[PDB]
Design a protein around this ligand. Sequence first.
Ligand SMILES: CC(C)(C)C(=O)N1CCC[C@H]1c1cccc(F)c1
Length: 262
Amino acid sequence: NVIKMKSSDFLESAEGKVSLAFHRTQGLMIMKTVYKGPNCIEHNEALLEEAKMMNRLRHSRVVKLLGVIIEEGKYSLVMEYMEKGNLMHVLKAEMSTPLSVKGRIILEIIEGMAYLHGKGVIHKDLKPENILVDNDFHIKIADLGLASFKMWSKLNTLYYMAPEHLNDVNAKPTEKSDVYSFAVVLWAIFANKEPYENAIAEQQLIMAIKSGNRPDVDDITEYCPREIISLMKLCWEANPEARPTFPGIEEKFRPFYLSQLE
Ligand SMILES: CC(C)(C)C(=O)N1CCC[C@H]1c1cccc(F)c1
């Protein structure tokens, strides 16, 4: 379960320094080059160690780590390609998407999160830019800011942040941290836009969220079923002990999806 790769396995293209790369043997991939600079092999013991723990993450709704590049002067993570881009990009394209496709995207996000909390991984940065979409509108979850991987992150969006982490950085994130973020993602999916569009200042704004202000449920111009609006209000309750587990979300939403939108 060692997956090292050489820089010269790959013909690049431009899109951290994310790059569209053809591996000469296995094909089209995405390459996050996290560092091009002086050899600094002081850390490789650790960067290979983090890469080991993310190779452990294999699920149809998570982005797969297909290989790493550790070479003197260039360090890269290589991910699978996702044709259509991130979730916001899709939601904002002109040909908008039926309620029932939005239904599945939600269920698939629910699935991927239940897998990650099963592995003890707290995502810590769930938001539409980390949700990637292929040609058939299937999503995979990614952690592009490297929020679970301190070593890679060091080398290298308050909208979705649970409030107990707003103006408190030392609080350890919990599963309920991500459930709040899922709540605002539900909102963005039906609003087809980022929340808090009309906000004065991010210091003003943070104080508003802590005091229980949320994104505008009226601002949802598409139809959004009642029970999904109630779900998102339930998932963004100020008290983390009052939000459900992702296992608990699924046990409510999968029946609702099967019997109302699929
Ligand atoms: C871009 C990388 C490779 C870091 C990426 O998104 N990874 C790698 C393995 C699985 C996946 C992932 C998804 C969600 C949360 C998380 F912490 C990690």
